[PDB]
RNA sequence: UGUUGCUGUUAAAGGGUUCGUAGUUGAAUUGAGGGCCUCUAAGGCGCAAUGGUUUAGUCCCAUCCACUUCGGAUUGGUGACCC
RNA sequence: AACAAAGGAGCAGCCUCUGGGCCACCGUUUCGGCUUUUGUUGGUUUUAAAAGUCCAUUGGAGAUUAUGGGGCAGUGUGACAA
RNA sequence: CUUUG
């Protein structure tokens, strides 16, 4: 059990992102809608800035932490990785 | 830092074959490491292996048997000639029976028997028992 | 002269072959009244030559060739065009392969390092394969070396695309073979991030 | 290990195995290249431009779509900086520390640091005269 | 006296710490072809086809027991498997 | 394996057939040199080749080798008084 | 349409 050329789920998913056999990212993109307009802006999950709503300006996120955190009352769908 | 890629393979492989592992991981990779395994793999010291792609630097995996005892590299890559071989065979190998020394010759990467036969000298590379 | 052999390069026009004609015609046919901007694009586009490769399978391997400068204009429309041709020609798959020319190793140190990397064997062969399975992409490569010294290669796709491409594969393999003279196999997976493999 | 300090970090970024761009993008080459140069006019360095452009436009690695990298783009339009970002950064840092020491002469830590910085300046400069990208008449102070 | 081939926690021996020139050492990559003709040629976990009578075993039918804990039968179907 | 070179916009360079037009080049610190034929030698000239350059023009390729596409139709002219 | 202003 647990061949090292063909691991399970468990024996990958834990590990730090460079210590897989793949060395993928760890992040994704999203779409976000504001109450004050009809738009979709496309925003980065670990944004690390304040981003002004596409065509509006009010800030859809705060840059805080190692993962950025959406401004309140703004709805958010996710997107694929593919 | 990381200097020799080659010896960062053959040291891993060696140790693991003692410790009772049936497989090994080898984190950097080279156009040298590959060849060195291909040799061994003929005789039966190495059973198979895989080569994984990451598009930066590869990884490699190795299978094992129990029929390998030690392998290593002879680091400065000294020089050898048609009579010279018997020096190395009296030294690094335990006997003139079952060992092999590995060389890089004009023709390509080979093992001492083959070398002498075709009458090339060349630099030296590593060994395996 | 013919109105439909301006969808073919100059130098095959006077005395054309058979399979050449069918394709050329089809493009000229399509070129009017198929909505917007695949009724302008294929004008510019021309074919270089053609081949029709015949395996022992149910279906046969129609392979096109067109020169490399039209590459940009093909990718956009590529999905569409592949559909349209499959309609017309029955019992044959259809693939669009751009045409490239390689440079071999010189065995000189100083010559080697001046080679344009794009046209070296590797990067060429990669692109060829990509052109075949166009939307599917390559999610991993591996090479498995046997006891016999014999290297194989295998390529991993996404299950998300699977039902579409699935049937086509043995054909596609045969095509890739008689172009590169290297072998290819295909698996799928279903999570590329952690890297598992389909069993379904 | 750290260049002239000690420490082992491993904070890093690993981009994906696939080098092909997403399905969902509705940009093409033109659109990208525009936005690059446009923001450069503010006085952003290559780093800052790339960060702005992932957080608003969803273009991750510019190289994937545009077929070339941030600095190449700007060189071709002549907006590339005369003295490259990485060393210019250092120089700015160093100057500030020197100012501080004109008032604070019993500070010791700062001066230990200043050494390290100034050293690093040299080493970079010497690889921008080994690789031609400065005059050979370049000097620090 | 140690290039092959030494020793440095406590037996003789890591220099208080750091920067740093000469000097020594330094990651990956352009790439290794196929086709055809035979020989008892070592394998296919690929496939068509005939042979299984408990003369293999296992699924799905049948019937009676049965509240844990029953087994006779239709080569059941050349699903499957030897050979 | 070593040595030297490059630091990529440090480029954004189509080719070929044919015909026409113009045109002496080469070195130059106060005009020096000039391949052949006209029996041969000396002096003089004409003619052609080739090169330079422009125009017209034939077939073909393109992977910045860049046509092509797009813009102004500012050397301008001619084909519509609709 | 052998131009028009």
XYZ file of C-alpha atoms (C1' of nucleotides) in Angstrom:
722
model
C 0.000 0.000 0.000
C 0.862 3.635 -0.735
C 3.053 3.493 -3.839
C 5.106 6.667 -4.125
C 4.374 7.146 -7.824
C 0.614 6.851 -7.265
C -0.366 8.101 -3.779
C -3.855 8.221 -2.221
C -5.918 11.350 -1.423
C -4.985 11.563 2.284
C -1.252 11.211 1.583
C -1.280 14.318 -0.627
C -3.980 16.700 0.608
C -2.332 17.374 4.017
C 1.053 18.426 2.731
C 2.649 21.810 2.038
C 2.297 22.988 -1.527
C 5.856 22.308 -2.767
C 6.040 18.895 -1.109
C 3.523 17.252 -3.413
C 4.636 15.540 -6.628
C 2.727 18.183 -8.580
C 3.711 21.517 -6.999
C 0.390 23.152 -7.893
C -0.969 26.474 -6.649
C -3.130 26.767 -3.547
C -5.509 29.448 -4.760
C -8.378 30.246 -7.096
C -10.332 33.137 -8.614
C -13.879 34.298 -7.994
C -16.564 36.621 -9.290
C -18.132 39.197 -7.024
C -21.171 41.480 -7.293
C -21.736 44.716 -5.380
C -25.145 46.019 -4.224
C -24.468 49.468 -5.689
C -24.166 48.418 -9.332
C -24.594 45.504 -11.722
C -21.139 44.257 -12.598
C -18.907 41.252 -12.260
C -15.319 41.899 -11.238
C -12.881 38.997 -11.072
C -10.930 38.899 -7.865
C -8.035 36.891 -6.455
C -8.588 34.763 -3.345
C -5.361 35.895 -1.641
C -5.747 39.390 -3.096
C -3.317 41.301 -0.856
C -4.681 44.698 -1.789
C -7.938 46.626 -1.516
C -9.628 46.307 -4.888
C -12.128 48.853 -6.127
C -15.289 47.282 -7.535
C -15.013 47.151 -11.322
C -16.756 50.332 -12.444
C -17.695 51.811 -9.079
C -15.079 52.116 -6.321
C -15.919 51.045 -2.766
C -13.574 48.095 -2.210
C -14.728 44.474 -2.456
C -12.061 43.204 -0.089
C -9.609 44.032 2.677
C -6.010 42.855 2.136
C -5.892 41.289 5.583
C -4.063 38.141 6.696
C -2.747 35.386 4.485
C -6.228 35.208 2.975
C -8.162 38.281 1.918
C -11.621 38.861 3.193
C -14.598 40.254 1.298
C -16.417 43.499 2.106
C -19.832 42.853 3.673
C -23.038 42.472 1.639
C -21.230 41.570 -1.591
C -22.162 38.185 -3.029
C -19.549 35.886 -4.493
C -19.616 32.891 -6.803
C -16.443 30.830 -7.370
C -14.804 29.710 -10.620
C -13.089 26.634 -12.036
C -9.345 25.931 -11.893
C -9.241 24.351 -15.329
C 24.691 24.222 -1.556
C 23.852 21.523 -4.106
C 27.012 20.695 -6.030
C 26.957 17.177 -7.487
C 23.544 16.042 -8.711
C 24.844 12.491 -9.345
C 25.984 11.703 -5.801
C 22.704 13.144 -4.468
C 21.071 10.211 -6.297
C 23.378 7.262 -5.622
C 23.705 8.058 -1.876
C 19.894 7.953 -1.416
C 19.506 4.678 -3.397
C 22.306 2.953 -1.413
C 21.021 3.907 2.085
C 17.390 2.947 1.293
C 18.419 -0.536 0.067
C 19.931 -1.148 3.523
C 16.984 0.298 5.509
C 14.560 -2.216 3.917
C 12.662 0.207 1.659
C 11.325 -1.177 -1.629
C 11.200 2.220 -3.357
C 13.051 5.521 -3.140
C 12.394 9.103 -4.248
C 15.176 11.149 -5.840
C 14.406 14.816 -5.828
C 16.745 16.459 -8.442
C 17.372 14.865 -11.818
C 19.873 14.980 -14.626
C 20.686 13.444 -18.006
C 23.336 11.461 -16.126
C 21.210 9.927 -13.310
C 18.837 8.386 -15.942
C 21.656 6.646 -17.898
C 23.352 5.370 -14.681
C 20.113 3.569 -13.735
C 19.558 2.207 -17.297
C 22.940 0.348 -16.970
C 22.072 -1.306 -13.622
C 18.509 -2.120 -14.729
C 19.862 -4.508 -17.408
C 21.652 -6.807 -14.950
C 18.841 -6.799 -12.357
C 20.125 -4.451 -9.631
C 17.306 -1.967 -10.379
C 13.879 -3.385 -11.178
C 12.065 -0.594 -13.039
C 11.585 3.093 -12.530
C 9.457 6.110 -13.410
C 10.309 9.670 -14.412
C 7.837 12.333 -13.274
C 7.550 15.740 -14.967
C 7.018 19.025 -13.117
C 8.224 21.456 -15.832
C 10.972 22.932 -13.680
C 13.144 20.033 -12.590
C 12.034 16.420 -12.624
C 11.632 13.785 -9.964
C 12.486 10.127 -10.332
C 11.398 7.023 -8.398
C 13.294 3.730 -8.200
C 12.287 0.152 -7.458
C 14.481 -2.318 -5.650
C 15.041 -6.023 -5.223
C 17.590 -6.730 -2.516
C 20.272 -7.704 -5.020
C 22.134 -4.387 -4.742
C 24.505 -3.862 -1.822
C 26.060 -0.448 -2.384
C 26.469 2.143 -5.119
C 28.169 5.506 -5.110
C 30.194 7.980 -7.111
C 33.918 8.625 -7.332
C 33.796 12.341 -7.136
C 36.644 14.186 -9.024
C 36.039 12.099 -12.190
C 39.613 10.859 -12.730
C 40.916 9.294 -15.937
C 41.449 5.726 -17.018
C 43.087 4.032 -20.002
C 43.165 0.511 -21.468
C 45.637 -1.031 -18.903
C 44.562 1.305 -16.044
C 41.236 -0.461 -15.186
C 42.835 -3.175 -13.005
C 43.853 -0.430 -10.507
C 40.208 0.574 -9.936
C 39.036 -3.062 -9.865
C 41.674 -4.015 -7.243
C 40.572 -0.975 -5.196
C 36.899 0.069 -5.141
C 35.424 -3.379 -5.921
C 35.765 -6.192 -3.334
C 36.639 -8.715 -6.048
C 37.357 -9.214 -9.739
C 34.211 -11.354 -9.893
C 30.853 -9.668 -9.515
C 31.450 -5.896 -9.277
C 31.233 -3.186 -11.928
C 32.801 0.240 -12.337
C 30.985 2.830 -14.460
C 32.749 5.127 -16.901
C 31.959 7.873 -19.365
C 33.808 6.997 -22.543
C 33.964 8.528 -26.016
C 31.177 6.195 -27.173
C 28.894 6.964 -24.238
C 28.234 5.922 -20.647
C 29.161 2.275 -20.112
C 30.525 -0.234 -17.582
C 34.132 -1.433 -17.400
C 33.776 -4.882 -19.075
C 32.109 -3.359 -22.182
C 34.785 -0.590 -22.218
C 37.827 -2.931 -22.281
C 36.120 -5.064 -24.980
C 35.616 -2.164 -27.392
C 39.048 -0.694 -26.498
C 38.146 2.711 -25.122
C 39.484 4.385 -22.014
C 37.642 7.383 -20.610
C 36.819 9.223 -17.392
C 35.162 7.472 -14.435
C 31.833 8.092 -12.848
C 30.749 5.702 -10.117
C 30.460 2.051 -9.170
C 27.920 -0.526 -8.066
C 28.308 -3.985 -6.531
C -10.004 28.594 -63.084
C -11.692 26.923 -60.100
C -13.210 29.213 -57.419
C -12.504 26.660 -54.677
C -8.779 25.956 -55.133
C -7.880 29.364 -53.725
C -8.377 27.554 -50.395
C -5.200 25.697 -51.283
C -1.640 27.037 -51.673
C -0.390 28.041 -55.136
C 1.898 25.155 -55.794
C -0.563 22.246 -55.543
C -3.212 23.995 -57.692
C -2.339 22.899 -61.313
C -2.493 19.148 -60.802
C -4.122 18.370 -57.454
C -4.774 15.012 -55.776
C -8.139 13.617 -54.766
C -8.455 14.064 -51.000
C -7.068 17.613 -51.455
C -10.148 18.667 -53.435
C -12.840 17.526 -50.958
C -11.365 19.609 -48.101
C -10.669 22.724 -50.253
C -14.282 22.677 -51.590
C -15.744 22.299 -48.064
C -13.985 25.459 -46.829
C -15.148 27.542 -49.833
C -18.670 26.133 -49.239
C -18.729 27.105 -45.543
C -17.329 30.584 -46.300
C -20.727 32.198 -46.974
C -23.639 32.422 -44.546
C -22.289 30.726 -41.440
C -22.876 33.789 -39.254
C -20.022 36.089 -38.234
C -16.238 35.864 -38.492
C -15.945 32.356 -39.747
C -17.206 33.952 -42.944
C -14.168 36.239 -42.976
C -11.384 34.238 -41.255
C -11.134 31.125 -43.588
C -10.497 33.454 -46.623
C -6.937 34.211 -45.424
C -6.495 30.559 -44.456
C -5.136 28.072 -46.987
C -3.927 24.486 -46.747
C -0.403 23.376 -47.584
C -0.908 19.714 -48.422
C -2.894 16.802 -46.995
C -2.691 13.114 -46.145
C -5.258 10.443 -45.345
C -3.936 7.695 -43.109
C -5.733 4.380 -42.932
C -5.539 2.215 -39.781
C -7.369 -1.055 -39.239
C -10.156 0.435 -37.134
C -13.790 1.381 -37.755
C -12.850 4.924 -38.759
C -9.985 6.559 -40.629
C -7.573 9.359 -39.903
C -8.063 12.523 -41.996
C -5.083 14.775 -41.259
C -4.771 18.260 -42.729
C -1.709 20.495 -42.990
C -1.666 24.264 -43.099
C 1.342 26.585 -42.677
C 2.371 27.973 -39.318
C 1.569 31.670 -39.830
C -2.204 31.077 -39.858
C -1.926 29.342 -36.437
C -3.501 32.273 -34.527
C -6.511 32.428 -36.871
C -7.151 28.681 -36.629
C -7.262 28.360 -32.812
C -10.291 30.642 -32.280
C -12.479 28.932 -34.883
C -10.933 25.436 -34.410
C -13.825 23.928 -32.393
C -16.418 24.997 -35.013
C -14.424 23.882 -38.110
C -13.722 20.395 -36.685
C -17.517 19.962 -36.235
C -18.416 21.177 -39.757
C -16.007 18.821 -41.572
C -17.045 15.726 -39.519
C -20.609 16.245 -40.865
C -19.564 16.096 -44.526
C -17.029 13.249 -44.568
C -18.578 10.052 -43.079
C -16.770 7.388 -41.024
C -13.620 9.435 -40.542
C -12.300 11.586 -37.702
C -10.626 14.909 -38.579
C -7.684 16.763 -37.004
C -5.859 19.967 -37.941
C -2.085 19.883 -37.596
C 0.240 22.843 -38.188
C 3.417 22.318 -40.127
C 6.852 22.760 -38.603
C 10.459 22.037 -39.486
C 13.151 20.941 -37.041
C 16.896 21.472 -36.688
C 19.135 18.624 -35.530
C 22.007 18.688 -33.021
C 25.254 19.848 -34.696
C 27.722 18.110 -32.304
C 29.588 21.416 -31.941
C 29.528 23.347 -28.671
C 29.399 26.787 -30.268
C 26.763 25.970 -32.900
C 24.495 24.283 -30.308
C 23.965 27.334 -28.110
C 22.839 29.506 -31.060
C 19.937 27.176 -32.038
C 16.454 28.730 -31.883
C 14.785 26.733 -29.117
C 11.250 26.809 -30.590
C 12.092 24.564 -33.565
C 13.974 21.947 -31.521
C 12.541 18.390 -31.523
C 10.932 18.463 -28.046
C 8.902 21.690 -28.337
C 7.756 20.766 -31.882
C 6.548 17.262 -30.841
C 4.698 18.724 -27.791
C 2.784 21.229 -29.981
C 1.825 18.495 -32.546
C 0.175 16.436 -29.766
C -1.598 19.510 -28.320
C -3.061 20.352 -31.774
C -4.696 16.879 -31.976
C -6.434 16.834 -28.542
C -7.085 20.615 -28.627
C -9.448 21.379 -25.644
C -8.389 18.395 -23.527
C -4.914 19.662 -22.474
C -2.110 17.772 -20.726
C -2.323 17.591 -16.955
C 0.776 15.462 -16.434
C 3.426 13.577 -18.369
C 5.380 10.534 -17.243
C 7.830 8.088 -18.778
C 8.060 4.517 -17.541
C 11.269 2.629 -18.152
C 10.994 -1.135 -18.351
C 13.433 -3.987 -17.655
C 14.265 -4.153 -21.365
C 15.659 -0.601 -21.473
C 12.552 0.393 -23.393
C 11.067 3.769 -22.527
C 7.336 4.398 -22.915
C 5.383 7.630 -22.435
C 1.873 8.293 -21.219
C -0.140 11.458 -20.891
C -2.938 12.330 -18.510
C -6.096 14.168 -19.401
C -9.017 15.594 -17.399
C -12.156 13.470 -16.763
C -14.150 16.717 -17.247
C -13.457 16.398 -20.992
C -13.612 12.614 -21.054
C -16.968 11.631 -22.582
C -16.291 13.879 -25.588
C -12.779 12.699 -26.508
C -12.991 9.127 -25.130
C -13.843 7.181 -28.308
C -11.371 9.022 -30.537
C -8.208 7.984 -28.644
C -6.864 4.825 -30.537
C -7.126 6.775 -33.849
C -5.304 9.823 -32.340
C -2.497 7.502 -31.084
C -2.043 6.050 -34.620
C -1.810 9.607 -36.065
C 0.772 10.846 -33.511
C 2.833 7.681 -34.212
C 3.149 8.067 -37.999
C 4.077 11.772 -37.558
C 6.736 11.780 -34.801
C 7.680 8.082 -34.722
C 7.250 8.051 -30.967
C 4.516 6.273 -29.031
C 1.849 7.800 -26.818
C -0.716 6.405 -24.407
C -3.481 8.163 -22.532
C -5.005 7.916 -19.098
C -7.316 10.340 -17.398
C -7.408 11.699 -13.887
C -10.069 13.618 -11.998
C -8.109 15.758 -9.586
C -4.864 17.185 -11.021
C -3.981 19.254 -7.939
C -3.280 16.251 -5.737
C -2.895 13.903 -8.727
C -5.043 10.771 -8.661
C -6.005 8.579 -11.636
C -9.411 7.430 -12.915
C -10.534 3.868 -12.302
C -13.923 4.518 -13.916
C 20.032 29.938 3.794
C 19.921 33.754 3.906
C 22.554 35.620 1.917
C 24.414 37.511 4.648
C 22.133 36.798 7.600
C 20.882 33.525 8.988
C 17.399 32.104 8.695
C 15.728 29.462 6.621
C 12.550 30.563 4.907
C 10.433 28.519 2.529
C 7.740 31.123 1.717
C 7.395 30.825 -1.969
C 5.090 30.635 -4.956
C 4.611 27.597 -7.182
C 2.692 28.257 -10.389
C 0.631 25.416 -11.947
C 1.837 22.474 -14.070
C -0.303 23.616 -17.010
C 1.158 26.618 -18.794
C -1.957 27.152 -20.927
C -4.285 30.032 -19.937
C -7.828 29.518 -18.497
C -11.036 28.929 -20.458
C -12.918 31.730 -18.743
C -10.741 34.694 -19.819
C -12.299 37.083 -22.322
C -9.091 39.051 -22.897
C -6.628 38.572 -25.703
C -3.038 39.782 -26.270
C -3.852 43.441 -27.160
C -6.043 44.047 -24.061
C -3.291 42.763 -21.712
C -0.349 44.708 -23.295
C -2.424 47.939 -23.175
C -3.191 47.645 -19.438
C 0.500 46.813 -18.639
C 1.988 49.955 -20.266
C -0.977 52.119 -19.148
C -0.333 51.476 -15.435
C 3.457 51.743 -15.942
C 2.937 55.468 -16.775
C 2.041 56.098 -13.105
C 5.589 55.113 -12.126
C 4.883 51.537 -11.060
C 7.771 49.065 -11.303
C 7.184 45.609 -12.979
C 6.368 43.956 -9.621
C 3.515 46.328 -8.673
C 1.981 46.174 -12.184
C 1.716 42.362 -12.091
C 0.048 42.432 -8.648
C -2.539 45.042 -9.660
C -3.310 42.995 -12.781
C -4.054 39.685 -11.002
C -6.295 41.357 -8.415
C -8.476 43.226 -10.911
C -8.308 41.592 -14.303
C -7.721 37.946 -13.393
C -4.591 37.586 -15.567
C -2.252 35.528 -13.414
C 0.944 34.815 -15.328
C 1.159 37.464 -18.070
C 3.658 35.285 -19.992
C 0.965 32.619 -20.630
C -1.399 34.861 -22.621
C 0.721 37.762 -23.986
C 3.491 35.320 -24.929
C 6.127 37.495 -23.234
C 6.981 38.831 -19.799
C 6.406 42.230 -18.098
C 9.913 43.629 -18.464
C 10.280 42.766 -22.185
C 6.983 44.642 -22.906
C 8.209 47.823 -21.164
C 11.681 47.660 -22.814
C 10.124 47.599 -26.291
C 8.120 50.748 -25.369
C 11.147 52.396 -23.697
C 9.404 52.715 -20.317
C 11.789 50.237 -18.637
C 13.760 51.780 -15.724
C 17.361 52.869 -16.393
C 18.682 51.375 -13.140
C 16.852 48.072 -12.480
C 14.241 47.752 -9.696
C 15.995 45.203 -7.458
C 19.170 47.217 -6.754
C 17.381 50.631 -6.776
C 15.215 49.260 -3.894
C 18.334 48.458 -1.811
C 19.918 51.915 -2.507
C 16.723 53.683 -1.288
C 16.703 51.591 1.946
C 20.413 52.237 2.668
C 20.181 56.063 2.263
C 17.354 56.238 4.863
C 19.457 54.328 7.425
C 22.418 56.682 6.821
C 20.169 59.732 7.498
C 19.058 58.204 10.832
C 22.699 57.726 11.902
C 23.475 61.443 11.394
C 21.314 62.009 14.499
C 21.787 58.700 16.295
C 25.463 58.072 16.834
C 25.185 55.718 19.808
C 23.012 53.345 17.758
C 24.935 50.158 17.084
C 22.442 47.727 15.504
C 21.750 50.023 12.499
C 25.463 50.175 11.633
C 25.918 46.359 11.719
C 23.047 46.295 9.204
C 24.349 49.116 6.972
C 27.535 47.043 6.290
C 25.450 44.039 5.031
C 23.303 46.292 2.776
C 26.259 48.176 1.176
C 28.022 44.825 0.530
C 24.939 43.443 -1.275
C 24.788 46.665 -3.457
C 28.285 45.843 -4.796
C 27.528 42.180 -5.631
C 24.368 43.058 -7.650
C 26.159 45.939 -9.446
C 28.971 43.591 -10.498
C 26.441 41.231 -12.138
C 24.944 44.250 -13.937
C 28.350 44.982 -15.391
C 29.119 41.298 -16.010
C 25.777 41.237 -17.794
C 25.736 44.546 -19.680
C 22.977 46.711 -18.238
C 24.914 49.506 -16.507
C 27.827 51.679 -17.687
C 31.276 50.422 -16.530
C 31.621 53.879 -14.910
C 28.910 52.980 -12.348
C 29.709 53.625 -8.702
C 27.742 53.646 -5.446
C 29.080 56.523 -3.343
C 52.591 12.740 6.702
C 47.656 10.490 5.355
C 46.641 11.976 -3.332
C 45.173 6.467 -2.748
C 44.787 6.842 3.352
C 44.651 9.718 9.506
C 42.926 12.786 13.661
C 40.176 17.602 16.091
C 33.017 16.545 22.429
C 36.261 14.427 26.925
C 43.146 11.539 24.879
C 47.432 16.972 21.088
C 44.010 20.047 17.800
C 37.690 24.580 15.200
C 40.445 29.701 15.214
C 35.478 35.237 20.032
C 31.600 36.917 16.039
C 30.665 39.025 11.128
C 31.624 41.262 6.363
C 35.066 40.172 2.337
C 39.325 40.219 -2.231
C 42.886 36.361 -4.667
C 41.923 31.133 -4.616
C 38.940 26.457 -4.733
C 33.786 24.691 -5.877
C 28.930 25.321 -8.414
C 21.589 23.283 -10.397
C 18.243 21.923 -14.886
C 17.584 22.084 -20.624
C 18.291 21.392 -27.258
C 19.034 13.793 -27.471
C 19.833 8.879 -28.772
C 14.970 7.100 -35.143
C 11.800 3.781 -37.314
C 9.763 0.093 -41.231
C 9.839 -4.693 -43.189
C 11.379 -10.465 -43.199
C 12.151 -14.979 -39.867
C 13.839 -18.026 -36.108
C 10.186 -23.121 -30.102
C 10.958 -15.918 -27.928
C 10.004 -14.370 -23.556
C 5.321 -12.409 -22.450
C -0.311 -10.106 -22.963
C -4.178 -9.332 -16.753
C -6.173 -8.104 -25.340
C -9.895 -10.754 -28.154
C -13.168 -14.999 -31.588
C -14.086 -20.108 -30.955
C -14.928 -25.950 -28.971
C -14.437 -29.065 -24.869
C -16.182 -28.472 -17.833
C -21.023 -34.823 -16.319
C -20.081 -31.059 -8.126
C -15.308 -33.800 -14.029
C -13.354 -26.393 -10.770
C -15.545 -22.416 -8.371
C -18.515 -18.288 -8.255
C -22.996 -14.781 -9.715
C -28.052 -14.715 -11.220
C -33.014 -18.506 -11.083
C -35.945 -22.647 -8.319
C -37.708 -24.878 -3.449
C -38.039 -26.127 1.402
C -36.075 -25.229 6.165
C -34.865 -21.016 9.007
C -35.652 -15.681 13.777
C -27.687 -15.688 14.583
C -26.740 -21.177 12.374
C -30.404 -25.100 5.642
C -28.802 -27.537 0.695
C -30.711 -30.707 -3.320
C -31.306 -28.859 -8.720
C -32.016 -26.607 -14.174
C -23.377 -28.528 -18.046
C -28.828 -22.256 -15.403
C -24.997 -18.101 -18.332
C -19.370 -21.335 -23.325
C -21.151 -13.170 -17.829
C -16.637 -15.549 -14.775
C -12.534 -19.507 -14.880
C -9.132 -23.088 -15.824
C -7.243 -26.517 -20.030
C 33.998 19.083 -18.603
C 36.689 23.864 -19.460
C 37.498 28.395 -22.660
C 35.437 32.610 -25.544
C 30.830 35.306 -27.071
C 25.616 36.945 -26.239
C 22.576 40.228 -22.157
C 17.699 39.561 -26.315
C 13.741 46.057 -29.913
C 21.259 45.210 -29.113
C 15.190 44.563 -34.682
C 10.745 45.645 -37.568
C 16.019 42.204 -43.125
C 11.196 38.469 -48.637
C 12.994 35.910 -52.844
C 13.256 34.807 -57.980
C 12.431 34.904 -63.611
C 12.167 38.671 -67.383
C 12.217 43.312 -69.897
C 13.125 48.623 -69.946
C 15.765 53.327 -68.332
C 19.917 55.811 -66.351
C 24.852 54.915 -64.922
C 32.237 53.809 -65.303
C 34.285 51.572 -61.333
C 38.543 50.444 -58.016
C 42.710 53.108 -54.553
C 43.715 58.157 -53.848
C 48.615 62.316 -48.124
C 48.916 68.042 -55.519
C 44.742 61.499 -60.876
C 46.938 57.003 -60.280
C 45.218 52.020 -62.191
C 42.051 49.169 -66.601
C 40.206 41.916 -68.628
C 39.575 40.417 -74.236
C 39.143 40.578 -79.728
C 40.342 43.448 -84.412
C 48.228 39.737 -87.832
C 51.930 41.742 -83.880
C 53.720 46.203 -81.054
C 52.748 51.683 -79.609
C 48.937 55.775 -79.239
C 43.173 56.672 -79.610
C 38.101 55.412 -79.537
C 33.484 52.700 -79.923
C 30.773 48.620 -78.453
C 29.335 44.697 -74.320
C 29.743 42.146 -69.828
C 29.462 42.778 -64.643
C 28.507 46.151 -60.651
C 25.522 50.397 -58.829
C 20.373 52.370 -59.133
C 15.372 53.078 -60.468
C 11.045 51.371 -62.907
C 8.086 47.667 -64.972
C 7.238 42.473 -64.363
C 7.164 36.455 -63.949
C 6.775 32.241 -60.664
C 7.167 30.882 -55.419
C 7.874 30.897 -50.115
C 7.518 33.129 -44.974
C 8.565 30.123 -38.521
C 9.674 39.059 -37.487
C 12.458 36.977 -43.022
C 6.959 40.454 -43.385
C 3.734 40.296 -46.831
C -1.185 40.768 -45.505
C -4.633 43.518 -42.774
C -5.674 48.644 -40.852
C -5.069 54.167 -41.133
C -4.100 59.047 -43.999
C -6.099 57.995 -50.362
C -0.843 65.196 -47.950
C 4.462 63.553 -54.819
C -0.451 63.269 -57.985
C -3.327 61.492 -62.302
C -7.466 59.024 -64.784
C -12.448 55.871 -64.952
C -19.215 58.878 -62.211
C -21.168 66.498 -64.102
C -24.940 60.211 -60.855
C -19.796 58.931 -69.948
C -13.944 61.675 -74.603
C -13.851 64.788 -66.277
C -16.349 68.372 -62.531
C -15.449 72.583 -59.335
